[PDB]
Each structure stands twice: as C-alpha cells, then as structure tokens.
Structure to design on (588 residues):
C-alpha cells in the first residue's frame, strides 16, 4: 500500500498578520530598513517556520537526483503531577468509606424542682456521617506494529528510541489524567456551592488598597485556627478547629507574581506580609471566580484501588497491544475547613445547610431543625420552612419544629428555602432533610 | 425494628451555581477543554462531594 | 491569532472515520465557536459539529 | 477615627495607644483610668491589649 499526498503548500494553516516580504520591499526608512541589505531574505522567510508535510525535491544542479534528509531527532518529554502529595494509601478490599463526626451540645440552666421529675430523661447526641465510593475505572490502550514500523527508519537506535517514546506516552497520559481529575475535584466542589466564598476584590478604603487581598487572606487564615473553633468554614456546619501547619493554599501563578512584585519587593521584613499556609501554585482553575483555595490536609479523600498493565500479541496481524488499568476513588471531606477566594461577583446566598439531615420519628413525635445560611454579604435573610410529606396533620412551625400526625406512613421531606431574587423573578436557595416514620 | 430509606437523591441539599457536567460537555475553547478528554468524569462529578 | 487542527495529516479508508480537535489561540478571555467544513467535493462525506 | 479608614488613622491610633500605655505606668500613679477614681499604678508586663 502507498499513501501519497499532492498539491501541498508550505503555508498550510498559517494566518498572516502582515506580509513581511511586502513590508521589507515597501519600507522607506521604517523599522524594516535593517533587512533591506539582506539578499536571500525571501527564501529564508518562505521556509523559516518549518514544513508540516514534505515532498520530494529534485537536486538543483541535476534534476534527476533527489535531495535526501541528513538528520533525524526524536523529542522526548516526562510529566508528573504536583498534587500527588495529597493522596492517601490503597484500599485492596471493600468499596465504601464511612466518616463520622460528633458535634457539641448546649448548656442547660440549673434547676432542682424541674430536675426532680426528669432524672431519667435522655438527650440525643449530635452526630453526622458521610460515605465515599470508588468512582474511577479506566484504561489506556496502545498498539505497536514493529514490523510495519521498520520501514520508517534507517537506524536501529532511532527505531528503539521511537518505540521507547511510544511506551513512555502511556505513563505521561496517566499522570496528566490524574492531575486533571484532582483539579476537577476542586472545580466540582466550587460548582456545587459547597465552599465558603471570601471576596478579595472589593476594598474597604480608596487609599491605595493594593494589599487588600493579602490582608483578607491573612485574616481568614488566622481566624481559621482560633482555639475555640468555628462552624462558618465547613459545608457540614460543624464547630471544628484547624491548625496552621495543616493548612494548604493553592493559588495561581499570576496571583503569586502580583503579590511578589507588589508587596514583597517593597516591604521591610517581609515576614509580616507573606502568606500563612503551605503555598502550592497551579495554572489557574476552570471556574470564573476562583483565584485561590485554602483547605485542610484532611479535605482530600483520594485513594487508589488498582494499578496494573497487561499485554497481548496478535500473531496474524503481527502486533502488540498494551493495556494499562487504573482504578481509583476520588472524593472530598465536608467536615474539613475549606474557603475559596473570589475576585468577581457572587450571589447573595451560596447554600443553606439543615443541621439534622437524616431523621427518624414516630407517629406522635416531634423533631427540631436548625438552618445555617451562607451569605456572602452582611445582609440577613430569613428562611421559610415547608414539608412535602402529604398527609394531613403533619406540620412544621416557623421556628423549625416538625410535628407528625398519629396516622401517617410515608417518607417526609423537610425544606428550608431563602429568596434572593426580585419580585416576579424569584431565585431560591434550598436546604433539605429526609425523615422516616417508625411504626 | 427496621428503619429504611427509599428513593433518596444523591443531591439532597445541594444547589449548584452552574452544571459542571453540562459545562464540560458543551465546551469549545473554554477552560474545561482539559476536562473534556476525561472518561469517567460524570461519576466523579456525581459522587465527588460525598 | 490562529486555529490549530491537532491531526494535520490523516489517511482513512472509504468507510472509515476520523476525529479532529481544534485549538483556538485567543488573546482575550472571551469564548468563540468553531465551525467545521470539508472541501473534498464528494457527496456522502460529512463532518459533524464535534 | 477608625483603625481601617486609612493608613494615617491607624498610625494615629498606634500613637494614642502608646501614649496611654506609657502614662498608665508612671511611678507616681494616677486616678484617671479606673472606675473608682483611686490613685493606682500599673506595670507594662501586666498590661494586656
């Protein structure tokens, strides 16, 4: 079989901003006057950018002879992912990971007249759980047809180098895809509205506020590690604590350069104006608003289940097949602190969290729910509660107390909604919880 | 006693600013072009937050 | 500034298919839509929007 | 004025704080910084901000 091409131009997919040969020819004392004395300028400009598809060229002196190629160079590259340090061990058996967290309780006023009748009363501890599963199962497939590949080389060294490059491409692809999956984790988390958003663009004073972003980042990092804890920085609304040595700040190259040229080059004793967490620089995020993300070491929940490679030879077709199987689980923990720095515009409310998300009540019982809205601004918004159970008799008050009718058997859905849009154009942010009924 | 739950969504209390899977699918020169070649991206996006 | 088609040289049979990707060098942050065409001049040959 | 209004207000606040701290610990004492208006003296090591 012969594969041949005809009528191929040197300027195949080139869009010209301007014609350099015409500019040189038509220059009159312009910046192109330096190239006027050059004699073989058109020939250099015609083929100086390289050729995509080559064709046989006859020799200049003798038209019968053809021109040969005198050099062959093989280009090699090796890639790694910089986020591999956030991975955990392996899971050889099982599929699901369970994570449990016990929160804090409230203080009760001291009383003896009341205590004399409720000694054996019980108070349910507050505890939440979430689950992680294996979700990545892929393989990389390539083929090597060495007998058909022999004709493209005249040197065994070049042939072997090309085969080795083909082999290395598989591992390069695996590393690149792993990095992209890890970045997709953060982008998905931001897209689902589970971060706490801090604006780093609006300043508090028009007096040369070129340090507003670094001041905000420093303050946020400082208040992330207050000893008494807080429940404003995690998507499960649990009072937790962070440590300074376990905080990782993933930022952008342009942000790093901006900080370095703006504050570090002009600050005396720059230790008072640097970042606080462990800094890792990447090539930006996918979402519009993200500029930097500050997370905890326990935020990542990435494990690898399988890594293997297997080959098979086709003797009728005279070739080799390589398969590289990778199985992994990629997830994040909602119990860990995570904040995202935004330099654009954001909605008034990002999410609403109902603290009891799973409940089981009897036909005459009651359940109390609490709601936490994540408002970017300082404006306070009210929640409204509803129940989509269906039976008549079950009702929820405005505070968040749900009572269940004595005759009812179906799964109840408790919703708390907040309105942030205008009239006739409503926009709603909803938190939800599920209630089962004991018989 | 036997407490069970039936027909529970995987997006119980989640309100999304934008659909990440739709953004990846309908991408032409955007910042998701690196996510386009990913094979099992839908499952990771679906169960990546717990 | 330019648009680069990742496979620039291809060889296919009369019943085969090929996949091409386009990379657009955009100076600004705006997003632009690519449109594909074939100038072979034969009926029955087609290219999709993807 | 305000610690965050501008860069001059912050340094003015620093000046006022330093002056107050200096005059709270004069050896002769002062009945100017307590609710009982009694003449008392503080120490720099015991001052907390």
């Amino acid at each position: 079989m012969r594969i041949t091409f005809n009528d191929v131009k040197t300027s195949l997919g080139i869009t010209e901003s301007y014609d350099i040969v015409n500019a040189i020819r038509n220059s009159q004392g312009d910046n192109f006057k330096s190239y006027v004395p050059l004699a073989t300028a058109n020939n250099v400009a015609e083929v100086g950018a390289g050729i995509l598809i080559n064709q046989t060229v006859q020799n200049d002196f003798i038209t019968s002879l053809v021109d040969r190629i005198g050099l062959v160079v093989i280009r090699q590259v090796s890639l790694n992912n910089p986020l591999k340090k956030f991975k955990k061990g392996q899971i050889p058996l099982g599929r699901t990971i369970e994570e449990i967290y016990t929160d804090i309780t409230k203080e009760k006023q001291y009383d003896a007249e009341e205590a004399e009748q409720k000694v054996f009363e019980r108070e349910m501890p507050n505890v939440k759980t979430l689950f992680h599963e294996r979700n990545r199962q892929g393989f990389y497939h390539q083929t090597i047809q060495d007998d058909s590949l022999k004709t493209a080389f005249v040197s065994w060294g070049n042939f072997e180098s090309f085969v080795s490059s083909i082999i290395n491409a598989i591992y390069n692809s695996a590393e690149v895809d792993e990095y992209e999956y890890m970045k997709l984790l953060v982008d998905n988390y931001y897209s689902k509205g589970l971060f706490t958003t801090v604006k780093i663009d609006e300043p508090t004073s028009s007096t040369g506020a070129l340090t507003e972003f670094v001041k905000k980042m420093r303050a946020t990092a400082r208040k992330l590690t207050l000893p008494q804890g807080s429940r404003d920085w995690n998507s499960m609304a649990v009072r937790t604590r962070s440590y300074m040595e376990d905080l990782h700040l993933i930022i952008d190259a342009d942000l790093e350069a901006e900080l370095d040229v703006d504050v570090l080059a002009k600050a005396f004793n720059m230790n008072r104006t640097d970042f606080l967490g462990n800094v890792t620089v990447i090539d930006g995020f996918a979402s519009t608003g993200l500029e930097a993300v500050l997370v905890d070491k326990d935020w990542f929940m990435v494990y690898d289940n399988l890594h293997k490679m297997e080959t098979v030879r086709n003797p009728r077709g005279l070739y080799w097949n390589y398969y590289y199987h990778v199985w992994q689980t990629l997830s994040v923990s909602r119990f860990a602190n995570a904040v995202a720095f935004v330099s654009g515009d954001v909605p008034a409310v990002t999410q609403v969290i109902v603290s009891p998300n799973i409940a089981a009540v009897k036909q005459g019982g009651q359940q109390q729910f609490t709601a936490y809205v994540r408002a970017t601004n300082a404006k306070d918004h009210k929640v409204v509660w509803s129940v989509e159970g269906g039976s008549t008799g079950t009702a929820i008050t405005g505070d968040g107390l749900l009572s269940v009718s004595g005759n009812e058997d179906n799964q109840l859905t408790v919703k708390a909604t907040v309105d942030i849009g205008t009239e006739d154009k409503p926009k709603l942010v909803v938190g939800e919880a599920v209630v089962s009924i004991r018989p």
